[PDB]
Amino acid sequence: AAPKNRRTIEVNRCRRRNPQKLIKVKNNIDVCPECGHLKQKHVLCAYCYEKVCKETAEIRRQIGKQEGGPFKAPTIETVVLYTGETPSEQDQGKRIIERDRKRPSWFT
């Protein structure tokens, strides 16, 4: 079917600008106590998560170097190590991954 008459600006302005079609204010925002950036509650801090994922990205890169080719996932557990630290007695008998930097504060 086809419109029988042009809708006026006022009619349209009532459609468009009612509270239903408006953007609602979010009330669940907070400050990330860790980094001090803004995070939504119920959601992980975007900054903090990026930080983790950049670290874990590099760890996965070192995993590839040592593994060296597809279909070579080991049958032991894994541990990650940084500059100036040694595997414990219980750490013995599992895969070691080395690093060229200091251990992060948040990663313990």
Partner: protein, 166 residues
Amino acid sequence: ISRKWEKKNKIVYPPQLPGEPRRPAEIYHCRRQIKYSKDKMWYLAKLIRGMSIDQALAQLEFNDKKGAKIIKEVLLEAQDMAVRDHNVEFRSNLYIAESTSGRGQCLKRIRYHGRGRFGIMEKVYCHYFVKLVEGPPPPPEPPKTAVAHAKEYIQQLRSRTIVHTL
């Protein structure tokens, strides 16, 4: 094309006498030719329309719409220049005075329908405008009380005249 909004930052007022209220600082800023619909931009403009800078940046951060990051940029640019050039003491004590989107210049392409028929498609562009006023944001007008309704009704009855006499 007109570019009035830019020039608004070049207005110089003469120095105030010590016996005067401290004039709020005043920053006008915009972005032109945003590839986004002007009416779509309106909703985001309308949202931040009366809030403080930080509170607007907060609201804009978690907003999913495309233009939301664009407005965030404009606001941060405006805040930066406010402190640097417009002699604003604190960056936090700014609120959005007016937030407006205009139609920018548009192009026309063709859309190919069935049979031989076609239509004229428009690559939509728009501008965004903002104004920042130094100081705490204005407290919203309180909702009208029963006593206020009553008060004004009394006023209204008292305004009656005997009509079409001397």
